Design a protein around this ligand. Structure first.
Ligand code: HEC
Ligand code: HEC
Ligand code: HEC
Ligand SMILES: [Cl-]
Ligand SMILES: [Cl-]
Ligand SMILES: [Cl-]
Ligand SMILES: [Cl-]
Ligand SMILES: [Cl-]
Ligand SMILES: [Co+2]
Lengths: 106, 106, 106
């Protein structure tokens, strides 16, 4: 998928998690987010398309999705145990990682 | 290890999972599969030896193993919970990631 | 963080795990080790400074931290279900991964 499609997936499912009632809804949304994070790692963002593909900034961009995926998995661990409120709070804290990348490459 | 050696490991241990009768067999097979997938990330496939190491195709190839590893971990979660049948069903779904990479790059 | 700071975070928190008494101490040390491992993926070791960031040595180096992060997570899985001693044993086994990278790129 496109980078923008994957960002829409991440943004939409974060809102699904915010409004969720039960753990299975949160689990499903976090799974879509993880798939979107890994697919986005394949993209070249507009900010960097004029730099070398081997540039340190492209590596910095890709590793950011490794960090996002691992943090999503931590929230998913809480959702699998049925801890809805804790999973929702951990999902909310993802936004620190979203924003950290946006400050550099948005 | 060799790219083909890592593929033999993935394939041998998928066959173990297909036939397994308990969660211990599955969990040990998935652990080997994850190690082979991560090690395969370090290789250049023959069909991409004519690409730069950070070309979009080589990124697609390497991230394909991150996707495989996360999907293996999903199956391993299920096996650690005694969901042997569900873990085996997750192993079957894994094959679409195997196939998609082979279609592009084998 | 720079690579040296990430390495001190790995070293320090491995020492906490060896000395820990309960699962909360082990879980929190493993979480910091994982964050440091992923942040280290973004760095260039001094022996590879003059190489392309996408050279095979640099890919080998970055995948080394994928393997370490996944091995850290296995230890966290053991600690999260309260198997403290098995988590401590697993954390001790990580050193073979630390040492393997060191022998090549330190
Ligand atoms: C880098 C490692 C990023 C992480 C982590 C996240 N995002 Fe992102 N985002 C990134 C870039 C380079 C861009 C610009 C390219 C583009 O798609 O526009 C974006 C953009 C968005 C957008 C707008 C998408 C669009 O319709 O154009 C959204 C809504 C967005 N990003 C949301 C988002 C969320 C919720 C994240 C964390 C869960 C997140 N992003 C992480 C780079 C990176
Ligand atoms: C890319 C991201 C791949 C994924 C995911 C999987 N495989 Fe693979 N495989 C890939 C390539 C580029 C090649 C060709 C290597 C070569 O030197 O020709 C292969 C090959 C195989 C083989 C045949 C090995 C041989 O001796 O020629 C097998 C049996 C195989 N792959 C199995 C396999 C399985 C079971 C996978 C998922 C569980 C899987 N592969 C994923 C690239 C990629
Ligand atoms: C590569 C994939 C590595 C893995 C895995 C681990 N380390 Fe590492 N380490 C690496 C390099 C290239 C270096 C040299 C850094 C430099 O700038 O010179 C290091 C260094 C250390 C150090 C010493 C730090 C210093 O004195 O500046 C320590 C204490 C250390 N590393 C610890 C450590 C541990 C405990 C690891 C596994 C849990 C580990 N490292 C993994 C590369 C890699
Ligand atoms: Cl997950
Ligand atoms: Cl990577
Ligand atoms: Cl696993
Ligand atoms: Cl890369
Ligand atoms: Cl972890
Ligand atoms: Co897990």
């Amino acid at each position: 998928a496109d980078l923008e499609d994957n960002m829409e997936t991440l943004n939409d499912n974060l809102k699904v998690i915010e409004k969720a009632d039960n753990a299975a809804q949160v689990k499903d949304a976090l799974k879509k987010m993880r798939k979107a994070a890994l697919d986005a790692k394949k993209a070249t963002p507009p900010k960097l398309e004029d730099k070398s593909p081997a540039s340190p900034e492209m590596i910095d961009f890709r590793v950011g999705f490794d960090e996002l995926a691992w943090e999503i998995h931590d929230a998913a661990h809480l959702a699998k145990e049925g801890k809805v409120k804790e999973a929702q709070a951990a999902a909310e804290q993802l936004k620190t990682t979203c924003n950290a990348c946006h400050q550099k490459y948005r």
